[PDB]
C-alpha cells in the first residue's frame, strides 16, 4: 500500500514513461561533450615567438636567425633572439591541424600557461557549486522547473562562452555552465528514478550510462565535423536551446508532490499519466481518499566515530576516482594519435569495461573489484608517465586501458557506496561522496597546472593518488553478503562479524 502500488496500477512500461525517460536522458550526450570539450576547444598547437617587423626576412634568408631552437628540433616556444628576449610581438601559430583554439586567439602560452587549467578549474568550481546549492534549490522548488532552468542556463552559458570578448568572460561563463550542467546531471537520474518502478530504475541507470558512452562518441563525431572552437562550442551548445524549448513537456515526479504535503497535484499528475498511457479507465478509480491511505544531517556524519572513518574512506575513494578519470580524459594531446580517433576509441572502450566490471562485482566481490580497478589504473598512469614520448601506439593502448579502468572504478564505487551506508543516512552519504568527487575534479586541473616544474609530474600525481586510495580502500568491509544495514547500531553489530 505505497506509491509503487499506484505506479504499477497506472503502468510501468507505458508510453508516457518510456517517452519521458528517452526524452530526459537525451541531453546526456551533450553532458559528456561539454565535460570533455576542453580537449578540442583548448588544444595547444606548436608556436614560436614572432620576429619583430623591424627586420626583413628577405635579407635574413629565413626564420632561423630570429628564433632559437629547442632540443626537439623546433623553434623555442617562449623566446626570441635580440639580433635573447621573451615574446614582445606576439606568437605565431600554425593552422595545419587546429584552425583555431583559445590558446591561439587569446595566446594562453608562456607566462600565461596556467590560464587554461585555471579556466577548467573554475568550470569544476561551477560544477561543485551548482550541485551544492541547486540540490537545495531543487528540493525547495521541484524537479522540472529546476531542470528547465538548467537547460536554459547551460545553453546560454555555452553560447556566451563561445562568443567571449576575453578570458575572464570565458572563465565566468564556464563557471555558470558548470553550475547548470552539474545541476541537470544530478537531477536527471533523480527525476527518472522517482518516476520509474523498481526494476526500470536500474534499467534507467544503465540507459544513462550507455547514453554517456554514446555522448563520448558524439563528441569525437562533432570534433571531426567542426574543428573551429568558436563553432565547435556553438554546435555543442545549440541542441541545449531546443532542449530548454521542449523541456516544458516534462511531467513532475509525483513523489516530490507527495513529500510537499499536497496530493491534489499528485492525483492530477497521475491522471495525466493515465491519459497519456491510455489507461484512463484504471486511473479513474484514483482519488484523494485513495491516495491519502496509500501515500503513507551532515553533522552526525562527522560526529559518530565509525561513521566519520567511513566517510573519510569514501571521500578518499571518490576523490581519487574523479581525480584519475578527469586527469586522464582531459589529456589527449600528447598521445601521438589524432584527437578524434583516440576520443572515439575512448568512447568505444567504455561499455566493455562496464560489462566486465559488473560481471566481476556480481561474481567475486566489490572491494576486490575496486582493488583490481584502482590499483591497475594507477599503475597504468605511472607507466604511461614513465614511458618516453617517442612511443605512440603503446601509450595509446595504455591510455584506453586506463580509461576503461576508470569507468569500471566509477561504476564499482557507485554500486558499492550505494549498499554500504545505513539506510538512515545513505542518501546523504551518496551526496557527500559526489561532492568529494567534484572537489577532486576541481583540484585535478590545478595539479595539471604544475607541469611547469616538471613536464611529467601531473601524470605522476594523477597516478600516485589512485594508488594511495587503493591502499586505503583495503580497510573497508566487504558487502557481498547483502546485509543491507538499517541504522547505526545495525552497522556496529555487523562490523564486528
Ligand atoms: O562514462 C562515464 O562518464 C561515467 C560512467 C557511467 O557510465 C555512469 O556513471 O553511468
Ligand atoms: Cl554530478
UniProtKB/Swiss-Prot annotation:
SUPFAM superfamilies xrefs: MFS general substrate transporter (SSF103473)
Mode of membrane association: Multi-pass membrane protein
Pfam families: Sugar_tr
GO molecular function: alpha-ketoglutarate transmembrane transporter activity; antiporter activity; chloride ion binding; identical protein binding; organic anion transmembrane transporter activity; prostaglandin transmembrane transporter activity; sodium-independent organic anion transmembrane transporter activity; solute:inorganic anion antiporter activity
Protein modification: Glycosylated. Glycosylation is necessary for proper targeting of the transporter to the plasma membrane.
Induction: Down-regulated by PGE2 and in ischemic kidney.
Membrane topology (Extracellular): 31-117, 170-177, 228-230, 331-340, 389-397
Domains as described in the record: Multiple cysteine residues are necessary for proper targeting to the plasma membrane.
NCBIfam families documented for this protein: 2A0119 (TIGR00898)
Protein name, UniProt field: Solute carrier family 22 member 6
Organism: Rattus norvegicus (Rat)
Gene name per UniProt: Slc22a6
Amino acid at each position: 500500500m505505497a506509491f509503487n502500488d499506484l505506479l504499477k496500477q497506472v503502468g510501468g512500461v507505458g508510453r508516457f514513461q518510456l517517452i519521458q525517460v528517452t526524452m530526459v536522458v537525451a541531453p546526456l550526450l551533450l553532458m559528456a561533450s561539454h565535460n570533455t570539450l576542453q580537449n578540442f576547444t583548448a588544444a595547444i598547437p606548436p608556436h614560436h615567438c614572432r620576429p619583430p617587423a623591424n627586420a626583413n626576412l628577405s635579407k635574413d634568408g629565413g626564420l632561423e636567425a630570429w628564433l632559437p631552437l629547442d632540443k626537439q628540433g623546433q623553434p623555442e616556444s617562449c623566446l626570441r633572439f635580440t639580433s635573447t628576449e621573451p615574446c614582445i610581438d606576439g606568437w605565431v601559430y600554425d593552422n595545419s591541424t587546429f584552425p583555431s583554439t583559445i590558446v591561439t586567439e587569446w595566446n594562453l602560452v608562456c607566462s600565461h600557461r596556467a590560464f587554461r587549467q585555471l579556466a577548467q578549474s573554475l568550470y569544476m568550481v561551477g560544477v561543485l557549486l551548482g550541485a551544492m546549492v541547486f540540490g537545495y534549490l531543487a528540493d525547495r522548488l521541484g524537479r522540472r522547473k529546476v531542470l528547465i532552468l538548467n537547460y536554459l542556463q547551460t545553453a546560454v552559458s555555452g553560447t556566451c562562452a563561445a562568443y567571449a570578448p576575453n578570458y575572464t568572460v570565458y572563465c565566468v561563463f564556464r563557471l555558470l555552465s558548470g553550475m547548470s550542467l552539474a545541476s541537470i546531471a544530478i537531477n536527471c537520474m533523480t527525476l527518472n528514478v522517482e518516476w520509474m518502478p523498481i526494476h526500470t530504475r536500474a534499467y534507467v541507470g544503465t540507459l544513462i550510462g550507455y547514453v554517456y558512452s554514446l555522448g563520448q562518441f558524439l563528441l569525437a563525431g562533432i570534433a571531426y565535423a567542426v574543428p573551429h572552437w568558436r563553432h565547435l562550442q556553438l554546435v555543442v551548445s545549440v541542441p541545449f536551446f531546443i532542449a530548454f524549448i521542449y523541456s516544458w513537456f516534462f511531467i513532475e515526479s509525483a513523489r516530490w508532490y507527495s513529500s510537499s504535503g499536497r496530493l491534489d497535484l499528485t492525483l492530477r499528475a497521475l491522471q495525466r499519466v493515465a491519459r497519456i498511457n491510455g489507461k484512463q479507465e484504471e486511473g479513474a478509480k484514483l482519488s484523494i481518499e485513495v491516495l491519502r491511505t496509500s501515500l503513507q544531517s551532515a553533522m552526525e556524519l562527522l560526529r559518530c566515530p565509525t561513521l566519520r572513518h567511513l566517510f573519510l574512506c569514501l571521500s578518499m575513494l571518490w576523490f581519487a576516482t574523479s581525480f584519475a578519470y578527469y586527469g586522464l580524459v582531459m589529456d589527449l594531446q600528447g598521445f601521438g594519435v589524432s584527437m578524434y580517433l583516440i576520443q572515439v576509441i575512448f568512447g568505444a572502450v567504455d561499455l566493455p569495461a562496464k560489462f566486465v566490471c559488473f560481471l566481476v562485482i556480481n561474481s567475486m566481490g566489490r572491494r576486490p573489484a575496486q582493488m583490481a580497478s584502482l590499483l591497475l589504473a594507477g599503475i597504468c598512469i605511472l607507466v604511461n608517465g614513465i614511458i618516453p614520448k617517442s612511443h605512440t601506439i603503446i601509450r595509446t593502448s595504455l591510455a584506453v586501458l586506463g580509461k576503461g579502468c576508470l569507468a569500471s572504478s566509477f561504476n564499482c564505487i557507485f554500486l558499492y557506496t550505494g549498499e554500504l551506508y545505513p539506510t538512515v543516512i545513505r542518501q546523504t552519504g551518496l551526496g557527500m561522496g559526489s561532492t568529494m568527487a567534484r572537489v577532486g575534479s576541481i583540484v585535478s586541473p590545478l595539479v595539471s597546472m604544475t607541469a611547469e616544474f616538471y613536464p611529467s609530474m601531473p601524470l605522476f600525481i594523477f597516478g600516485a593518488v589512485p594508488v594511495v586510495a587503493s591502499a586505503v580502500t583495503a580497510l573497508l568491509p566487504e558487502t557481498l553478503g547483502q546485509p543491507l544495514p538499517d541504522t547505526v547500531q545495525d552497522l556496529k553489530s555487523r562490523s564486528r562479524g
